[PDB]
Design a protein around this ligand. Structure first.
Ligand SMILES: [K+]
Length: 288
């Protein structure tokens, strides 16, 4: 899941749990099964608490809770999905966390690979500190200045994959689809892009994120597909109007692009577990 999936999941989470009373959380399997997340014990001891919001910034999601009997007791649930992390209203296969609310309400987080993370904290300061680690939300921020791209002599694919330098929310498929639409070669250094290309790139980031966010079944949040179509969408990037009804991969994991050009499954950024495969068609994307 990338920026859009996280945001749409938060939206759904708020629809069902905002204002509800959380009573407990169980980590029944996975990485937290035996060793609970940081702050878990203190958090459990302070439950029940009501949920006031479920917000996101890029790929980062969090629950904000408060204590109905102590205005000063505020708590937060930090969450990152990882490659296989999914939220749902039913106990799906590979459920790792089970959130029990009052009045029959239940939420679940599934994660076959166990890359998602959890953390509980009662500090707004730490939350603000954490949010400073992320750049503007490429999907939610409609007035982002990406001219900072010029100050970097690094492949543009690395700059867009990074969550701090220019903005947050872009993943391996969004960056590939966006660089294809902007006809820019992944290896092109930021400092070598023209002001025009910058403008053009900005346009397509808004375009793709919005298309992704408005979709109902891209595939990375299948446990919420039924609910995805039973809820609306916020109006991010208002002045951009994608023509397609659903997000479709033009090069991401494709052997050829729409026209017929070949797509290179190029491994440009990352090391070890962080290495990712960038898909691009040399026919369309040039270093110019
Ligand atoms: K107090």
């Amino acid at each position: 899941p990338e920026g859009p999936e996280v945001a749409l999941t938060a939206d759904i989470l708020e629809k069902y749990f905002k204002g509800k009373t959380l009573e407990y959380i169980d980590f029944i399997s996975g990485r937290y099964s035996k060793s609970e997340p940081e702050g878990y014990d203190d958090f459990i001891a302070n439950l029940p608490l009501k949920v006031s919001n479920v917000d996101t910034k890029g790929k980062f999601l969090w629950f904000e809770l408060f204590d109905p009997n102590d205005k000063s007791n505020k708590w937060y649930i930090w969450n990152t999905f990882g490659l296989t992390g999914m939220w749902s209203l039913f106990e799906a296969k590979y459920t790792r966390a089970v959130l029990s609310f009052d009045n029959e309400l239940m939420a679940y987080f599934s994660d076959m690979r166990n890359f998602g993370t959890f953390k509980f904290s009662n500090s707004e300061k730490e939350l603000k500190r954490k949010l400073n680690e992320l750049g503007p939300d490429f999907l939610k921020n409609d007035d982002i200045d990406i001219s900072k791209i010029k100050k970097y002599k690094q492949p543009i694919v690395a700059l867009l994959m990074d969550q701090k330098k220019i903005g947050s929310g872009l993943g391996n498929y969004l960056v590939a689809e966006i660089l294809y639409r902007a006809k820019i070669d992944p290896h092109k250094l930021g400092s070598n892009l023209t002001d025009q290309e910058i403008e053009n790139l900005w346009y397509w980031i808004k375009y793709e994120t919005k298309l992704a966010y408005d979709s109902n079944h891209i595939g990375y949040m299948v446990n919420l597909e039924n609910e995805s179509s039973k809820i609306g969408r916020k109006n991010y990037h208002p002045n951009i109007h994608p023509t397609e009804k659903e997000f479709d991969f033009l090069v991401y994991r494709k052997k050829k692009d729409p026209n017929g050009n070949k797509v290179i499954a190029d491994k440009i950024i990352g090391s070890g577990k962080n290495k990712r495969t960038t898909y691009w068609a040399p026919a369309i994307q040039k270093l110019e």
